[PDB]
Ligand binder design. Structure first.
Ligand code: NA
Lengths: 98, 9, 276
């Protein structure tokens, strides 16, 4: 089994109070069954668009999860991922500098 | 256009 | 540049009443052009590229018929593999396939390929000669014997050298302008204060297409390959990509550092520094 790699980031450079898209890009995982959650203040975000699942030359899968959002404080954003390869879920916070 | 497998695994 | 067509297939068995999920994705020069998913409302091959919209109804019907047959083939193969590995029922298992051909710029067949993986590990592959099989483990040897005794390699070679090459020629014409599209990167440097009188300098490349890019940091000439931090190329979600590269630099010495961006869409590489 391959352990997923996560990157959480925005579609556009983050402006203090501008409508943007938050992305969660998960890669290098096998089996393809995965659970991805997008959080605001540690709370699940409704209407989270998921891309179709594809796999790479090394057989591992990848997927893009995205939601409409607005920074700055407003309000700390994250992505939570559960997969068979890792014991206990993994949370990755959005960091506007990365 | 895709291919069709014949004999199974 | 060389060209290619590939089909990536996946069948995932599910515990319960539902039969396995079957997804087939076609790629022309690494760009998704068709997709079939058995878990759709009306499962059919659908165009995924603008230039595929040129295809007549006969094309889609014939492609959809092949996929329905293949969903059944993957179903029986998953059943056979379960028995080979003496695995318990009520599990979720994955069978994947990659197949296609590579063409030269002169449209000459370079190579054909066919490979399968079970549970994420190589299972069986067609050799470059397209006549013999390389079976990875003990169970795969059961498949190899079955396929040598059925002449499976002759049927795959005929497709890989024939129809695969013919359809790729036809797709290449139909979508030459679409495939040759480029979006040039916009770049800027950000300054991130750290402790110990140091600064992270981050060079960003945004909204570029295709994904291939090179980000380089330099100190008074000569690359900083050694301690440079990179992020993996990411889709922005709108069809373009993003990447950044960073270096940790001492305070006051930032103007000695230069970042370069190399991308096929550019008239010339971009050169930039932290602008205070
Ligand atoms: Na790849």
């Amino acid at each position: 089994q391959k352990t997923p790699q996560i990157q959480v980031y925005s579609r556009h450079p983050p402006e203090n109070g501008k409508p943007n898209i938050l992305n969660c890009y998960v890669t290098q995982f096998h089996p393809p069954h995965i659970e991805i959650q997008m959080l605001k203040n540690g709370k699940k975000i409704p209407k989270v668009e998921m891309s179709d699942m594809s796999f790479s030359k090394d057989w591992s899968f990848y997927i893009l999860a995205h939601t409409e959002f607005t920074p700055t404080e407003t309000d700390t954003y994250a992505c939570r991922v559960k997969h068979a390869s890792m014991a206990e879920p993994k949370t990755v916070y959005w960091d506007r500098d990365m | 256009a895709s291919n069709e497998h014949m004999e199974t695994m | 540049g060389p060209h290619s067509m590939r089909y990536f297939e996946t069948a995932v068995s599910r515990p319960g009443l539902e039969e396995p999920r079957y997804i087939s994705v076609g790629y022309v020069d690494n760009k998704e052009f068709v997709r079939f998913d058995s878990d759709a409302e009306n499962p059919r091959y659908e165009p995924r590229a603008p230039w595929m919209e040129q295809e007549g109804p006969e094309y889609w019907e014939r492609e959809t018929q092949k996929a329905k047959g293949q969903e059944q083939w993957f179903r029986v193969s998953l059943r056979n593999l379960l028995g080979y590995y003496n695995q318990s029922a009520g599990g979720s298992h994955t069978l994947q396939q990659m197949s296609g051909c590579d063409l030269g710029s002169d449209w000459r067949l370079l190579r054909g390929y066919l490979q399968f993986a079970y549970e994420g590990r190589d299972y069986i592959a067609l050799n470059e000669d397209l006549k013999t099989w390389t079976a990875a483990d003990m169970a795969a040897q059961i498949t190899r014997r079955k396929w040598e005794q059925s002449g499976a390699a002759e049927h795959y070679k005929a497709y890989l050298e024939g129809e695969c090459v013919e359809w790729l020629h036809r797709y290449l014409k139909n979508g030459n302008a679409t495939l040759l599209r480029t979006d040039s990167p916009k770049a800027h440097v950000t300054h991130h204060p750290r402790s110990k009188g140091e600064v992270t300098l981050r060079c960003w490349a945004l909204g570029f297409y295709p994904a291939d890019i090179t980000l380089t940091w330099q100190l008074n000439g000569e690359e900083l390959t050694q301690d440079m931090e990179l992020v993996e190329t990411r889709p922005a979600g709108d069809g373009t990509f993003q990447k950044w590269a960073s270096v940790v630099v001492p305070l006051g010495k930032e103007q000695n550092y230069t970042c370069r961006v190399y991308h096929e869409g550019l008239p010339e590489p971009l050169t930039l520094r932290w602008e205070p």
